[PDB]
């Protein structure tokens, strides 16, 4: 109820949505090492 | 001095004119956008 539904997202923000944050910075690895490999 | 409604006259240019329908003055603005560095280079060196 008040406690059971409180942890739906309170403790769920560490394993459910971290993929979004990880992919929000994934551009660096695909972009800059790719350019390094292309030029060198 | 107090006859400006303030809809299209606020700009310090005249919209009217067949020779310059905001086409000659703005092309001059285009020219002067890159004119000063080009002439600065041209005075001492080549472009």
């Amino acid at each position: 109820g008040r406690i059971g539904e409180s942890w739906v997202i309170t403790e769920g923000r560490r394993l459910i949505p971290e993929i979004f944050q990880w992919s929000a910075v994934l551009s660096v690895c695909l972009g800059w090492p790719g350019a390094v490999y292309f030029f060198s | 001095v107090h006859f400006k409604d303030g809809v299209y006259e606020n700009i310090p240019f005249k919209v009217k004119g067949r020779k310059t329908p905001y086409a000659l003055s703005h092309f001059g603005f285009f020219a002067i956008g890159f004119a000063v560095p080009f002439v600065a280079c041209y005075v001492q060196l080549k472009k």
Binding site: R13, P17, F20, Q21, A24, V36, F39, S40 | -
Partner: protein
Amino acid sequence: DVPTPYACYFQDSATPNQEGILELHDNIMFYLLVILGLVSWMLYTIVMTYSKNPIAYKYIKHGQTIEVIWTIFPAVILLIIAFPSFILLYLCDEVISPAMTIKAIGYQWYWKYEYSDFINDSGETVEFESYVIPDELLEEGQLRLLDTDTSMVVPVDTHIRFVVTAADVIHDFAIPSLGIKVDATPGRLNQVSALIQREGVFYGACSELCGTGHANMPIKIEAVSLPKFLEWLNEQ
């Protein structure tokens, strides 16, 4: 060491002060990266949640207790990151048992180095010249903007002071590997403490405007074995 294309790491440390300051800066930038990640996650979660926010709250103003909590958090954080900075600066600004001195008073658009600490044959000073190598003089065996007429030899495993000054315009004695850089006022005089630990070749430049020939004023130093260094100071 030597600048390299598409590098990913700082050059090898040449003095213990360099390694200490780089490690402390690494810890500082670790803290900076974690707080930047904090702020980035703040922004990301807030925008993602409120791109479809149903209700806009309006009556939360100060929260004085938690307000002063995040007001006193940065102060203690900066004090914590400054205590190692405090001890590092207190150790670095002092000179502990210096051994010898090398001086560099470069003229306009080129460098000049002085080795008055060592005697060439008997009493007389050691002094030489060093000028840039342009494209026309860039033959097979020289580097553009990285090779000078004469290299600068350094005594390995020896505490060395850098009594640096200028003549006409401020010239910047820059050796990134040694972690040394001081702008030399022509009328003033500045000295710093350092000592090279390993044997190697390092390149530098002038990171301070000189004039028309400011660019072609490189610094080319090197390190060799102690008998070889002593012999070089003997012959020159």
